[PDB]
C-alpha cells in the first residue's frame with residue numbers, strides 16, 4: 001500500500017500517493033495536473049466531491065468508476081490509476097481518478113485537413129462508445145481533450161443546449177445514439193466556419209434556430225410524435241423548408257458539407273451512424289476499417305437497481321480494489 005501525503009489546493013484537500021507530484025489545479029469534483037514519477041507522464045487527477053452524499057451521488061460514483069474501468073480506446077478517456085487514502089471499507093469516503101493529461105480542450109483549439117483529423121478521431125471514439133451501448137448525451141468542445149499533437153479523447157466533465165439534439169430539447173424519452181452524431185455535426189460546423197451553429201438562448205430558441213436550417217418536420221417524422229402538446233407547438237410554427245447546405249456552408253470542402261448533411265438530418269432515424277461516418281470519403285486519408293475497434297461487452301444492468309448508499313459504496317470499493325493498471 002503506497003504512502004499518501006496531504007495538501008490543500010483552493011479550499012479542497014488532496015491526499016494522493018507520493019508517486020504523484022507538483023499537483024496544480026486545472027478546473028473546478030475538482031481536477032489537478034500532476035507529475036507521475038512512476039512513468040514520467042503528466043496526469044490529470046479527479047477527486048470526487050462527497051461521493052456518498054446521497055443514493056444518486058453514490059450511484060454516480062459507481063457509474064463513473066465502472067465506465068472509466070471499461071473504456072480502453074485511443075480516442076476515449078481511460079484510467080491509469082484509481083485510489084483512496086482509506087485502508088478499510090468502513091472509512092472509505094474519497095475516490096480519486098487518474099488519466100493521461102492532454103492539456104487543452106477543443107474550445108482552446110484550422111485547415112480542412114485539421115478538421116478531417118479532429119472529426120475522424122471523435123467518430124472513431126464514438127464508434128467504440130456506441131458499440132458498448134452507451135450514449136454520451138453531452139458531446140461539446142469542452143468535453144473533447146486535445147494534446148499538442150492534435151490527438152483527441154472524448155471525456156465527460158459533467159451552453160450544453162447549443163450541441164444538443166432537437167429531440168432532446170423536445171423532451172422525447174426514446175432518443176437513440178444518433179443524438180451524439182447531431183452534436184458532432186454541430187462541432188464540425190463550428191470548426192469549419194468559426195461560429196456556433198445554433199447559439200440558442202433557451203430550449204424554445206434552440207429548437208427555432210435548428211428548424212430554420214433543417215426545416216420543420218415532414219409527414220414521416222410527424223407520424224412518430226406521440227405528444228399532442230409537442231405536435232401542437234411544432235405544427236403551429238411558420239413551416240420552414242430544409243436549407244441548401246451547399247449555400248449555408250459555401251467555402252467549406254464540399255465533401256465536408258455532404259457529411260454535415262448526413263449528420264444533421266432532423267429525423268434521428270435517418271442520421272448517419274458513427275461506423276458509417278468513418279467510411280465517408282471525407283476521411284479517406286485517415287479511415288482504416290482494421291484500426292477502428294469496438295468495445296468488449298459492458299454490463300450496465302446496475303442502472304435499473306435501487307440500492308442503499310452503503311451498497312453503492314461497497315460495490316465502488318470492490319471496483320477500486322480489483323483495479324489493474326494498463327501496461
Ligand SMILES: Cc1ccc(-n2nc(C(C)(C)C)cc2NC(=O)N[C@H]2CC[C@H](Oc3ccc4nnc(C(C)C)n4c3)c3ccccc32)cc1
Pocket residue numbers: 026031044045046060061063064067068071076077097098099100101102103104105129134135136145146154155156157158
Ligand atoms: C457521473 C459520470 C461522470 C462522467 C462520466 N464519464 N463518462 C465518460 C465517457 C462517456 C466514457 C466519455 C467519461 C467520464 N468521466 C470523465 O471523463 N472523467 C474525467 C472528467 C475530466 C477530468 O479531467 C481531465 C482529464 C484529462 C484531461 N486532459 N486534458 C484535460 C483538460 C486540459 C481539459 N483533461 C481533463 C478527469 C480527470 C481524471 C479522471 C477522469 C476525468 C461518467 C459518469
Ligand SMILES: Fc1ccc(-c2c[nH]nc2-c2ccnc(F)c2)cc1
Pocket residue numbers: 166167170171172217221224225226227230234266267268269
Ligand atoms: F420538432 C421536432 C420534431 C421531432 C424531432 C425528432 C427528431 N428525431 N426524432 C424526433 C422525435 C421522434 C419521436 N418523438 C418525438 F417527440 C421526436 C425533433 C424536433
